[PDB]
């Protein structure tokens, strides 16, 4: 980015992200039907999407359980966001995986990440990053969880489901160039799953406890190893001014500015 | 007739103030016209003062009354003017009009004015008490208010009376400014803050209003003098209260149309003088200029400038205002080069070289403005901008003559007071950014300044020059010698000015708007001058009172305000409703059409890009437009800001906008029209955007309230949040505040360190102390939240906030305000929102908050609290509330239809003997009663019958009883009620309808034991309160007379919910254990209010669910309608008195000719509202319309009377019922309402009880109450409120009941949900544990824990637990789930009582009583309190200790406390035998040692701490003698 003017454009233009919200397409194709098939609850998606932003992907965390009596589907009832930046093509996150009380009852799903440009294939540095967690992370199942990629389209946004395979999730543990062609990737590395959204639940939010989750705006204030704590409360906009403290920041001033126009007119208490 | 639209635009008179409504003005005498090259000049000479009167002289200090002639010091005689109207002054409450030119000292004869008030309330042993009158004095200009509370501080100081400004904000400051008496404002602070209410606290403490320079009438601002004049003239008439009003003016004609207006006596109040009185006689010079171009213009008015201050460059003194801030200093050094270009002629301003100190001026020479290069010869500058001490200095500079040049500002005159020998006022003309243009400057303005011309002391006569525009030059004479008239500016203003008055209540519909616009100065102005102001004279003589040119007008600001939706008005009715946006608008006082472009602009989904456009559209901005020659800077300073505008190119739009931010960032603007327009934006943003957050908090739209209470905080401090928060205390050095933001180490992380480890951040511990203090001075709340389902629908939250900062007034100052507000799953939309307000006494005080908020379909993760500082920038604490395990209850059944029955006759039951005491009274049933016949009277079996309060279940009962009398001669009943009113107003009726005329005996149990046993047994129906019937039957199984009997009635059941509920459920439960024993049944009857839950009820009594009825509350014999008003004002005061004309109306309304009760919160609330529902009756024209009999006839009533207010509210047709009354004085009132006599009684909540007197309409006023313990208001209880709402009922006659709550905000939606709907229920029994177990274990019910468990079962708690188990904290619904909780019960309720000794507990399995919890048990007293008394009392105590250690008893705690019973209660503890141990007066086991005292001291108390004192002594004994044991 060019740090002032880029900012300014794309940030006039985040404000109009909740427009996309209502019009959303879900790739539907064929359903393995041995597989698990994810619910993700609309209102969550709705709010992920409106503290996006247009360029830098910005990446959530899915908890969710299955229905009783229902072990094929997994609803996804959480999304959590962590201390984060992203690139255009890719969302860098730190190490550790949310650890909070509320998510004790539920198991992670995976996460989900804003793609600024559509392409029908999982990033290999999606697949990269997944297997890589999945190789820190036993607590993620290799079948069982998955990478939502969200896309903006025009005025829209549209989603698609991923898991990785097992040829998928070795070449992500080996991988370690993170250009958008590294060797040995292969379509035959991930697959699509079943995904729909749904009114019939709500889903919630977990934040970062002391502050919040968008360094994006502080890229050297983010550290793979970094550690955070969590809290129930819902994600602040990607150009809230919270997220943004260098620019608030910038004042020079001398005080005795004020000396001129020392009239001082208010009658008004 | 039908009103007609009419065009407002070409009605009003543009350039006002500078209007000249005459054409033609006058010479003085010995005035001359003469014109020069371009320039005509005219001159007059000074005036001659008239010959002083035959026998006329000025009053010294000496002569005028006694205590008047403190403050006074200093000064040894009275001016002539003063002088002539002093007399008047102190010795008449006449309305006061004086007409005086500039000069004359006017502010001291106001001041007596004061000074008579003052002395109105006066003591011998003390002077001046100050809680009986407040002033209010009305200044034109700020500075002039700041220096006359500086100097009227001083003065009246010997009297030791607060006079202050009133600048307060207001909720930080009116319980500040509530203090404070005889306050200085500017008109419109009043005009605000009398629209939102913070006026009308302390109105009625007005009997004196001051008027200064009242000839701003004629000024644009203008009709706001005229709104205030009027709405207190209107006001005094409703009232019948009077105030004095005193104008003052500058000497203009029209001065008996201001006498009219201010409704002054000509005869004795009007006061007269022309311009040959001002002290220092006036020579008038002006100049006029002709020429057009503006470019030889700008050197004609220097050169004219040069010869005029050379005329007087020898010895005397010029002063020159200039309307600019930096051409203070460019005008001087023009004349300095011009003096130098004259080959040093004009210099040597002095005697000599050395003489009349040149050192003076030489030696002066360092100094902070531009000083420096004119001081050192013989002239300098003035302003507010460059410096802030050296004005000062420069002020004694001039006094002392050292300086006989001075060029300066306006405000130089408006501020501290220094005359010049001779004035010069350069050009006239001013930039009105409000204009956004350039205009001659303000009547008020010229007059100020050139009254400022000749001293009082070392002058002879003064001269003044006005240089001006030769157009403008007519206008100038016809002021300052008396040609101009004062003319109202107010139809411009008059559909803003109309919307206020609906908002404050005071205009219903067009008929008061004509009555209200017929006080105004434009009033009485049409009256007298219709050819000005657009009336033919033909049309004026249709029409002689103008009221269809009244009705006219007005018509089109009615359409004006529904129009842009601030009113919704129908041309049919001619009544106004008001709206919330109206009252926004109102509130800030913005204009009606800024506040339709923000109703149509503002939207959810709103960015800060966007909001601040939305603000640059406001239509107050409308004139702002950009100039060619600073669109240069404007872009520069558009791409310097941090909010986006690009939206928007180079338009107002823009400018507007980046000026915002160029304030809000701190930024320097080089052009000065620029700086002038910045100015006026960012001084009217703040209530700008105030007035878009309240909108758009009040549509709940979470995220754009945000952004707008953020950018007010932004306005208001000046910077962004991207700005360390430390900046709000401007205590801070900035340097190092800039080092704090220079790394990024979030604010939030400042608390983790202590004073060394700050310093280390910043590598600057010489601060690292000073900086720790600011960071605990930063307001910091912490939060606890406690939630439990309510039903599926509703949960309820109880959110603790603990103050974490540390408070100091000189920051945080007497309140601090903070908005809690809870938001929804996405933050998005605000579920709920309260103002909290923590004032300084209260820090490190919890305070407690309890709302309620609904829950939907999707369950949701959580919901957010949140709570912010209102005026603190980057203050917020957020707490997020899980509902990741809530379990919501399970749905409630439908109640049971009612069937369509024919109506039951009394002639049902076959004995004759009952259909007797029915008969005579009602010829048919209720359909619930019909419904419930067969099942409670020809059948045997348990029932259940919920109905809304007002269904006629006494009978329903009554039936049960009936049947039990043909069951049995002896037949035995116990009856129950858990309020002993309701319970004595049962035995009244039953005494009679059954010991009267069926022979049976009725009994009402007592609180003693002997006696109350002896009383059933007797008695064929028991009746009892849960206490009475606790005691006794807790030892049943040795009472024979408890356990023979053969019905059992519970009435109001649901009470099980409220506290002393817990009481019932046991005794209900107890019940049932005994018909197990006694191998007989006991028929159970229970009657409740409608119960959602109500199968829970009938399954833990025992009735099958073909013998339940539950209805819902819209079942009832007389249907209802309900209304609910809520009030936005959180302050009880203010909302308590706004409501007061709302009860009136209400009336009017819902029940005009029926009879009316009103519920009030306070015992002495009822006399006050009782008393205003009179004073506003007087109002409608309608007088004692509440009165159906003549005088003669309430004689034989009155006669019995006491309270001698009573007496005058009962003669008009009202009257109230309260503690106080005399039971002989309640009976009468009663019997005087329901006999038909009075229409309306007011009465305290207490009574809703006890009341035996029905209505047609009911109101409850506010239902908060005041709790003296915790220091806060506390809503009614529920069943309470339900209670008063039964009480219409009149089923007798009407075919409806009508019932209007008026509330607070908050507590709006909990009542639209909650009266509707059943009511759930839900058991206390967990909470109130230990006084049972320990009782029950003393009679061997429970021998062993197995034995508790199993107690338990037999509850209502036992069955609400798996229902809604979130509720008693029980974590899941299972089998074990309840085991194991019931268990974890037993186990510590019985620990808990092993601990206190009143019980042993051995094997871990078995129990016994011991001494103590055998003593508890046999006294009827708390645990804890026999607990207390066993770690209290020792070898040594005597009667002193006794009554402290009685007095903490638990029983005590419900003795309450009231408003102000904290200094109350010190002034008796004075007086007492026994002091006390630095004791707090808020808590009432001090109150009860006092008043216990007392009592043995036989002291004659108050009755309110009497009554106290009686319950007191009612349970003494009983303490007492467990002492003995």
């Not at chain 2, 200085?184 to 200064?212: F, H, M, N």
Request: contains cysteine; hydrophobic residues 40%.
């Amino acid at each position: 980015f060019s740090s002032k003017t880029e900012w300014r454009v794309r940030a006039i233009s985040a404000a109009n992200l909740h427009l996309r919200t209502n019009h959303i397409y879900v790739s539907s194709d064929d359903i393995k039907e041995t597989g698990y098939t994810y619910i993700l609850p609309k209102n969550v998606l709705k709010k992920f999407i409106c503290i996006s932003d247009l360029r830098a992907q910005i990446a959530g965390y899915l908890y969710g359980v299955s229905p009783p009596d229902n072990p094929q589907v997994k609803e996804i009832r959480c999304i959590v966001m962590v201390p984060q930046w992203g690139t255009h093509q890719t969302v860098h996150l730190p190490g550790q995986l949310p650890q909070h009380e509320y998510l004790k009852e539920m198991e992670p799903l995976g996460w989900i990440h804003t793609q600024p440009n559509e392409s029908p294939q999982l990033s290999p540095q999606d697949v990269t990053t997944h297997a890589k967690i999945m190789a820190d992370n036993p607590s993620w199942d290799g079948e069982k969880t998955i990478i939502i990629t969200c896309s903006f389209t025009p005025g829209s946004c549209t989603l698609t489901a991923y898991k990785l395979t097992p040829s998928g999730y070795e070449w992500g543990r080996q991988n370690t160039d993170k250009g958008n062609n590294p060797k040995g990737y292969l379509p035959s590395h991930y697959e699509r799953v079943q995904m729909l959204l749904s009114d019939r639940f709500l889903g919630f939010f977990m934040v970062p406890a002391q502050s919040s989750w968008n360094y994006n705006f502080m890229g050297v204030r983010h550290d793979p190893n970094m550690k955070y704590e969590l809290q129930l409360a819902n994600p602040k906009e990607f150009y809230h001014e919270v997220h943004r403290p260098s620019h608030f920041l910038n004042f020079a001033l001398l005080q005795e500015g004020e000396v001129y126009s020392a009239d001082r007119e208010d009658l008004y208490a | 007739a039908p009103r007609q639209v009419l065009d407002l635009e070409d009605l009003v008179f543009t350039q006002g103030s500078h209007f000249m409504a005459n054409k033609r003005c006058q010479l003085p005498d010995g005035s001359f016209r003469r014109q020069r090259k371009g320039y005509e000049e005219v001159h007059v000479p000074a005036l001659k003062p008239k010959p002083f009167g035959s026998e006329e002289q000025l009053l010294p200090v000496e002569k005028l009354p006694k205590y008047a002639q403190a403050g006074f010091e200093g000064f040894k005689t009275l001016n002539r003017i003063q002088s002539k109207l002093y007399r008047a002054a102190l010795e008449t409450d006449e309305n006061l009009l004086l007409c005086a030119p500039t000069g004359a000292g006017k502010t001291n004869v106001a001041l007596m004015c004061m000074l008579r008030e003052i002395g109105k309330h006066i003591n011998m042993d003390g002077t001046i008490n100050v809680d009986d009158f407040k002033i209010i004095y009305i200044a034109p200009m700020r500075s002039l208010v700041q220096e006359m509370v500086g100097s009227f501080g001083k003065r009246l100081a010997t009297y030791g009376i607060t006079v202050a400004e009133l600048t307060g904000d207001h909720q930080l400051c009116k319980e500040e400014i509530s203090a404070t008496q005889i306050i200085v404002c500017t008109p419109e602070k009043w005009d605000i803050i009398t629209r939102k209410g913070g006026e009308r606290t302390y109105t009625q403490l007005v009997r004196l209003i001051i008027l200064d320079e009242i000839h701003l009438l004629h000024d644009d601002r203008g009709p706001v003098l005229e709104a205030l004049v009027a709405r207190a003239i209107r006001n005094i008439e409703m009232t019948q209260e009077d105030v004095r009003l005193i104008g003052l003016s500058a000497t203009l004609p029209n001065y008996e149309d201001v006498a009219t207006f201010l409704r002054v006596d000509p005869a004795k109040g009007l006061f007269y003088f022309d311009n040959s009185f001002r002290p220092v006689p006036l020579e008038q010079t002006y100049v006029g200029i002709t020429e057009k171009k503006a470019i030889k213009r700008f050197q004609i008015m220097n050169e004219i400038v040069y010869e005029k201050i050379m005329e007087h460059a020898g010895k005397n003194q010029v002063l020159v205002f200039v309307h600019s801030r930096k051409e203070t200093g460019k005008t001087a050094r023009a004349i300095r080069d011009m003096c130098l270009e004259k080959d040093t002629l004009g210099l040597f301003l002095r005697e000599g070289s050395a003489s009349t100190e040149v050192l003076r001026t030489e030696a002066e020479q360092c100094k902070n403005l531009e000083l420096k290069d004119l001081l050192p010869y013989g002239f300098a500058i003035h302003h507010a901008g460059m410096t802030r001490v050296d004005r000062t200095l420069v002020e004694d500079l001039f006094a002392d003559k050292h300086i006989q040049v001075l060029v300066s500002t306006a405000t130089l005159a408006w501020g501290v007071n220094l005359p010049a020998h001779t004035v010069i006022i350069k050009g006239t003309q001013v930039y009105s950014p409000e204009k956004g243009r350039w205009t001659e400057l303000g009547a008020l303005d010229i007059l100020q300044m050139l009254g400022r011309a000749g001293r009082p002391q070392y002058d002879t006569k003064g001269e003044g020059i006005l240089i001006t525009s030769h157009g403008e030059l007519q206008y100038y004479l016809s002021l300052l010698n008396q040609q101009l008239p004062i003319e109202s500016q107010m139809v411009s203003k008059l559909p803003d000015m109309l919307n206020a008055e609906i908002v404050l209540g005071n205009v219903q519909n067009a008929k008061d708007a004509v009555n209200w616009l017929g006080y105004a100065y434009l009033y009485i102005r049409m009256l007298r001058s219709p050819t000005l102001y657009g009336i033919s004279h033909d049309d004026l003589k249709g029409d002689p009172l103008l009221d269809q040119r009244r009705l006219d007008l007005v018509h089109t600001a009615a359409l004006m305000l529904d129009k842009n939706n601030l009113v919704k008005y129908d041309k049919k009715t001619g009544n106004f409703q008001v709206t919330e946006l109206g009252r926004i608008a109102s509130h800030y006082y913005i204009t009606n059409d800024t506040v339709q472009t923000y109703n149509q602009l503002l939207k959810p989904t709103l960015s800060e890009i966007e909001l601040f456009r939305v603000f640059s559209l406001s239509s107050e901005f409308k004139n702002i437009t950009v100039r060619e020659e600073e669109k240069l800077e404007l872009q520069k300073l558009l791409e310097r800001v941090p909010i986006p505008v690009k939206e928007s190119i180079e338009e107002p739009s823009a400018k507007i906008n980046v000026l915002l931010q160029a304030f809000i960032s701190q930024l320097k603007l080089e052009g000065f029209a620029l700086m002038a327009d910045m100015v006026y934006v960012t001084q009217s943003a703040g209530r700008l955007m105030r007035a878009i957050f309240e909108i758009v908090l009040n549509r709940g739209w979470a995220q754009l309230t945000d952004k707008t209470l953020n950018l007010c905080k932004m306005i208001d401090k000046r910077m962004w949040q991207s700005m360390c928060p430390l900046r709000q205390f401007r205590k801070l050095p900035e340097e190092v505040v800039k080092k704090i933001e220079k790394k990024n180490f979030p604010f939030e992380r400042l608390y983790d360190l202590n004073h060394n480890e700050i310093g280390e951040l910043i590598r600057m511990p010489k601060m690292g102390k000073t900086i720790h203090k600011y960071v605990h001075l930063f307001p910091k709340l912490e939060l606890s939240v406690h939630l439990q389902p309510i039903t599926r629908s509703t949960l309820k939250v109880e959110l603790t906030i603990t103050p974490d900062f540390q408070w100091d007034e000189k920051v945080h100052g007497s309140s601090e305000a903070f908005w809690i507000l809870v938001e929804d799953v996405d933050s998005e939309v605000i579920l709920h929102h309260e103002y909290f307000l923590l004032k300084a006494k209260y820090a490190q005080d919890e305070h407690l908050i309890t709302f309620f908020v609904p829950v939907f379909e999707p369950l949701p993760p959580q919901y957010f609290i949140r709570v912010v500082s209102d005026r603190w920038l980057s203050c917020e604490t957020q707490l997020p509330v899980s509902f990741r395990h809530l379990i919501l209850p399970e749905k409630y059944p439908p109640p049971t239809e009612l069937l369509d029955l024919q109506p039951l006759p009394v002639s049902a039951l076959r004995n004759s003997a009952f259909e007797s005491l029915y008969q005579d009274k009602f010829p048919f049933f209720n359909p619930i009663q019909t419904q419930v016949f067969n099942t409670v009277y020809n059948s045997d079996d348990n029932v259940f019958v919920g109905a809304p309060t007002g269904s006629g279940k006494t009978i329903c009962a009554e039936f049960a009883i009936l049947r039990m009398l043909l069951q049995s001669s002896e037949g035995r009943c116990v009856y129950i009620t858990p309020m002993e009113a309701l319970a004595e107003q049962v035995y009244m009726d039953w005494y009679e309808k059954f010991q009267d005329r069926l022979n049976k005996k009725v009994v009402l149990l007592t609180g003693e034991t002997s006696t109350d046993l002896k009383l059933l047994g007797k008695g064929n129906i028991i009746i009892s309160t849960p206490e009475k019937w606790d005691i006794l039957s807790r030892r049943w199984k040795q009472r024979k007379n408890v356990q023979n009997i053969n019905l059992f009635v519970v009435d109001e059941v649901h009470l099980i919910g409220g506290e002393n509920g817990p009481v019932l459920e046991v005794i209900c439960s107890r019940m049932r254990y005994i018909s197990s024993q006694i191998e007989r049944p006991i028929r159970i009857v229970a009657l409740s209010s409608s119960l959602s839950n109500a199968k829970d009820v009938a399954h833990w009594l025992g009735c099958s669910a073909t013998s339940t009825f539950n209805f819902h509350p819209n079942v009832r014999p007389v249907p209802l309608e309900l209304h609910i008003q809520g009030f936005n004002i959180s302050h009880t005061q203010t909302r308590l008195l706004s409501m007061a004309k709302p009860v009136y109306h209400a009336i009017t309304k819902h029940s005009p000719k029926k009879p009316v009760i009103v519920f009030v919160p306070s015992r002495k609330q009822t006399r006050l509202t009782a008393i205003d529902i009179l004073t506003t009756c007087a109002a409608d024209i309608q007088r004692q319309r509440f009165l159906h009999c003549t005088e003669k006839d309430l004689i034989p009533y009155l006669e019995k009377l006491s309270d001698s207010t009573l007496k005058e509210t009962l003669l008009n047709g009202v009257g109230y019922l309260h503690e106080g009354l005399s039971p002989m004085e309640r009976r009468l009132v009663e019997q005087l309402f329901s006999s038909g006599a009075i229409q309306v009684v007011v009465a305290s909540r207490s009574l809703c009880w006890g009341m035996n007197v029905a209505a047609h309409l009911v109101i409850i006023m506010d239902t908060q109450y005041y709790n003296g313990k915790i220091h806060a208001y506390v809503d009614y209880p529920i069943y309470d409120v339900l209670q008063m709402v039964g009480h219409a009922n009149r089923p007798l006659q009407d075919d409806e009941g009508r019932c209007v709550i008026m509330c607070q905000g908050s507590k709006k939606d909990f009542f639209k949900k909650f009266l509707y709907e059943p009511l759930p229920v839900e058991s206390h029994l967990d909470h109130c544990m230990h006084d049972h177990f320990n009782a029950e274990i003393v009679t061997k019910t429970i021998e062993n824990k197995q034995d508790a468990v199993d107690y338990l079962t037999w509850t209502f708690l036992y069955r609400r637990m798996t229902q809604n188990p979130n509720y008693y904290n029980l974590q899941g619904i299972s089998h074990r789930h309840l085991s194991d909780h019931l268990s974890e019960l037993v186990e510590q309720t019985l620990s808990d009582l092993e601990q206190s000794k009143c019980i042993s507990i051995e094997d871990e399995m078995d129990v016994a009583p011991l001494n103590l919890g055998m003593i508890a048990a046999y006294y009827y007293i708390n645990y804890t309190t026999i607990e207390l008394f066993s770690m209290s009392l020792n070898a040594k105590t005597k009667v002193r200790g006794l009554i402290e250690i009685i007095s903490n008893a638990a029983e005590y705690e419900n003795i309450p406390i009231r408003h102000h019973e904290d200094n109350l209660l010190r002034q008796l503890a004075q007086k007492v035998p026994h002091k006390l141990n630095n004791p707090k007066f808020n808590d009432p086991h001090v109150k009860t040692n006092l008043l216990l005292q007392a009592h043995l001291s036989r002291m004659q108390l108050s009755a309110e701490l009497q009554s106290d004192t009686e319950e007191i002594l009612s349970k003494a004994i009983r303490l007492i003698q467990a002492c003995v044991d």
